[PDB]
């Protein structure tokens, strides 16, 4: 997250870290055993970390649980990035308390200029490299489809949206992938892709979660 702020410990309780030896991706806790993330974050040997703030030191609210299953959307296209969504089942059920809590799926799609929170442990430099220890947060509005499609011609599908600032300086970046875009307590997006980070006229691109809700619930129930 470039241009954000320190969220403050355990204040985004549905944020998880995906770990393969190191923090490689974000995700969202949707109930006690399911996490949702991006399909481009798919690896084997995932461990999910819940209750993180400083991902570099054990502060005592953590739960580290291995994934049993990882289900990437059956229609994920790794060229076009369409359907960049994946679900991870935990080996065992987390315990849910005040540092670790799940996030509600939306009932409808968010409109242009709704303000969201994007959070993550990704790079905090637009050009440069600097990965934080603590979790970072950013308020960024949803952009209009029409301006999203002008930022990225012929790359935006009905399952993407754009969020951020055409002026640049505030965005999500490498590390943030698979983490939440939460807008009025509901899960609207998944950090997905961009042209670099925090570039003028190139806002970030997110998976549009409101389209997948029926797919998520039925996939959760039958696995």
């Amino acid at each position: 997250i470039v241009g954000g702020y320190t969220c403050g410990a355990n204040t985004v309780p549905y944020q998880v870290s995906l770990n393969s030896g190191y923090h490689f991706c974000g995700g969202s806790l949707i109930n006690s055993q399911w996490v949702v993330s991006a399909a481009h974050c798919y690896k084997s040997g995932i461990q999910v970390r819940l209750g993180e703030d400083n991902i570099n030191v054990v502060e005592g609210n953590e739960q580290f649980i291995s994934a049993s299953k990882s289900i990437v959307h059956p229609s994920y296209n790794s060229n076009t990035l369409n359907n960049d969504i994946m679900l991870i089942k935990l080996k065992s059920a987390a315990s849910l308390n005040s540092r670790v809590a799940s996030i509600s799926l939306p009932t409808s799609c968010a409109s242009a200029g709704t303000q969201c929170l994007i959070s993550g442990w990704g790079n905090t430099k637009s050009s440069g490299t600097s990965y934080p220890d603590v979790l970072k947060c950013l308020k960024a509005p949803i952009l209009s489809d029409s301006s999203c499609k002008s930022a990225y011609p012929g790359q935006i599908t009905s399952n993407m949206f754009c969020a951020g600032y055409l002026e640049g300086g505030k965005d999500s970046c490498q590390g943030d992938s698979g983490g939440p875009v939460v807008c009025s307590g509901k899960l609207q997006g998944i950090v997905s892709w961009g042209s670099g980070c925090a570039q003028k006229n190139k806002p970030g691109v997110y998976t549009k979660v409101c389209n997948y809700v029926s797919w998520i619930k039925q996939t959760i129930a039958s696995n």
Partner: protein, 58 residues
């Protein structure tokens, strides 16, 4: 050896932080770099050993 082994490492437009290897023809070795998790080029290996077997000698 081959020509893709001389290409600069490509992070791409996806925003994971995944550590991969690339052949650094200037150093004459395989280095690590951050791969964003999609649209990899061919100078992009999952271990130094794969990287060395393919490229080492370029």
């Amino acid at each position: 050896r081959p020509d893709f082994c001389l290409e600069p490492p490509y992070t791409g437009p996806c925003k994971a932080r995944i550590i991969r290897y690339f052949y650094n023809a200037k150093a004459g070795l395989c280095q690590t770099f951050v791969y964003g998790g999609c649209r990899a080029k061919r100078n992009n290996f999952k271990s130094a050993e794969d990287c060395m077997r393919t490229c080492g000698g370029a």
